[PDB]
Amino acid sequence: KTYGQSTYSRQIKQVEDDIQQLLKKINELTGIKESDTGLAPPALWDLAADKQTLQSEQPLQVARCTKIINADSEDPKYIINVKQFAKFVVDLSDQVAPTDIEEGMRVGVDRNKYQIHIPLPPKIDPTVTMMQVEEKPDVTYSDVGGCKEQIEKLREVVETPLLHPERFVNLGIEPPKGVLLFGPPGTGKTLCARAVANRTDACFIRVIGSELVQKYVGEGARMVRELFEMARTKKACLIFFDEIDAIGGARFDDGAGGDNEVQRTMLELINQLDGFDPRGNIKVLMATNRPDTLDPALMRPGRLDRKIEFSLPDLEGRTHIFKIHARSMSVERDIRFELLARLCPNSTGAEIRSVCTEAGMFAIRARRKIATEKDFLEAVNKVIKSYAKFSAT
Amino acid sequence: XXXXXXXXXXXXXXXXXXXXXXXXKXXX
């Protein structure tokens, strides 16, 4: 029928199972009020419901929000629309200082006498809010081993002015404000993107390249404005592009009736990158697989300065990436990896990790608790034979 | 096949009403 996998297998299980059933049967025995078409459970608003709600009824107001057009002289005398109600000439209430009421500002205005009470943060549409990352993944610089030249070049540019604005002052230079990354795939482009977004000390902003192509004209450009407007507010922010071939590579005009709307969007990226009132503290990283069919307006330095390529390292990066991926698993102490790397001369780090995840499958092809070296021998026995007579290769 | 489009607007109507028992002098 069945058997014990480890000793008291059901004996810990139903002890856990009925008490989760009992945590239910507590609540209906106490009386639980759930699913009451959009309310709160009663155990925490019964001591909220009384007169410190009337403290939100009678002292608080409605404060209808608006938008500012301009100011006047000697006095505020502000001209303001609501949204579609009426445009008014109104005044601030006395609870503000007439300093941060600059033009083009969403502000809240009293409903009765039409006076300004609260300045509000501006309208950021959610489609670019969902590309600000707001968290940072756990990727260490040590995890991208095998790239001693490439990380060192990229350390010099993205990291060091943002954390040491001293040496560049004392010598009098300007850092190369934009870097392109390229190479064969699966090599470590996205790893370095995550690893810099780890230690950023900045407002790292993700951009997927094909999120700009849309159905209407000009709205794809209107994204790029809102990016570089938040960039000038969030001082010293990073912007990562990825697969910039969708943003535009050519200016096909022999039969100029094909792609045009991506060209207009790509020209808007050109102007707000460099030209007429520079950006200050913004660094741009790009990453593509074919850096050959791009527009040479991007290839102009000032915009894209360093061309860092990612190769298949030699023989010792593979041994080190082995020591990155096969440090973190449960193996035998009889490791060796110069034997392993000489068996796979042409391979990516993705193909390295694919072997290490394949190696754990053989222990689960078997019924083991561990990863044996001879099992990992048998893991590297198949994947040599697997990669010799692979379907695509 | 790869063809963009513009747009348009259909603005809603608006109407207001009151109890209309308010006098508008107060001057004099």
Partner: protein, 50 residues
Amino acid sequence: SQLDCNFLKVVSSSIVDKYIGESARLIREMFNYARDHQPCIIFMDEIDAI
């Protein structure tokens, strides 16, 4: 430059709007203004927009 009072000029590109009607509504008003004053001249450069 002869009349200087009874001459209507239209760029034929600012006629468009964001609403659905409202571009015809200019044209009805134009000819009706051209109906009221009797010897009127209409000039629309660059029709190729409209």
